Amino acid sequence: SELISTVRQCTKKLQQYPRLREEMERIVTTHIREREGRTKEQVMLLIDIELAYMNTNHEDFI
Amino acid sequence: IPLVNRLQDAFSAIGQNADLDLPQIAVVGGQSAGKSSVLENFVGRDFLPRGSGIVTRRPLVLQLVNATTEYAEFLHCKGKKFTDFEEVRLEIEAETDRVTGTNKGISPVPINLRVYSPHVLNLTLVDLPGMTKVPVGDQPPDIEFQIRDMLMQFVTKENCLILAVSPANSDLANSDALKVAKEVDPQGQRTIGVITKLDLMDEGTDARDVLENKLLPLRRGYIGVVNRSQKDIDGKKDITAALAAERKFFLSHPSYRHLADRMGTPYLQKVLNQQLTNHIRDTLPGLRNKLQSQLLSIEKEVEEYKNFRPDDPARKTKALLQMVQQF
Amino acid sequence: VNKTVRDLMPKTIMHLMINNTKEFIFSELLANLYSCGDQNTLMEESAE
């Protein structure tokens, strides 16, 4: 929600052109919303890795 | 049929509480412009109050939704399922009168109505009263400001496409629709202009200079429509012959035949479809994944379910063995 | 576990999203920007 607004912030003011602040925003935002799926998948899989071994050899005191 | 309609049909079929998240549409203009008539012709079915004078005297929040077959429900006749549109229109006008009064008064309290249809989007249409300056009847002296801010509270929000309705009778420079359109949407990126009453222009005059988007250049262009006259409304003219007559008029008028393809109500429907198509995306990659995971959560059992035949010893014994092992 | 998720969750998002949309902006934006639309009725002067 913050990066997709920063893209708007850096496209609204440089682009006087109509439809070129539209196609640009559309393409960049679609790429970002395509990447959000992959990053959410990786975060979920990181959690599912942290539910696998539950180490104790680390610096927690026994 | 449009692919956005087919996608909405598939969404209704899967029945999950998901939506394409289309922007709402608000139709605005001057009094007696033709706003309600354009709205009902875009819907496709005649269920709106249309007459001379002040008619649309209360903000109608329509919600077109998709279902198996068509009906309509208000938020006051709870449980009732209005089905015939003469009854729907009579109920609408009675509901307006029950709060506004029978002396051309208005009320900003919205009438929330929902229509069901087999092949429509989950749209959100907003019909609004026209803009007036001098109070008539028993309206308060500040009726202009009342209507102004009353429709501003609905239009000034984002994801609210604007249908700026203007007659072809008055010179375009007077358009109360265009004033608000350029006031709230300066760049004109969510504004569409429609010119009504093209059959009522003075002899020797034509709207070529405005329909070619030259007189007041607007980004989205101006769509010219020709609704049913008041005589036709009283005579109960039907939509199909009305559209045929509109097509005949566009093909016969020497100053518009070169734009007949781009003029007319079906073109306006197509343009709204195009805008909604361009607005539903930018969320599809989120939504495509959002239901791709849903398909993932069932593809495993779908493997057992694609090829099931009763009395299959292999599947029966395999299921028995795994059931026993887990027990 | 809280420490090792706080130290690692910024890295994963900023390798899969930030440093990938940034690379996309460098190296692919013009290629598909040419393709989307008309490539002719684009960058039309605003009336202003």
Place this chain on the structure above:
Amino acid sequence: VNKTVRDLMPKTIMHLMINNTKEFIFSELLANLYSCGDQNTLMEESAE
């Protein structure tokens, strides 16, 4: 970074390799073994 890779190399291996081959054994092995052809020869009586 050595601490963080040392705490997540085991977990990474096992969540993908071991705690998945275990579920494969407990769930899917029976289906493959019963579905492979020639049931009469999958179980050969040994002479012993």
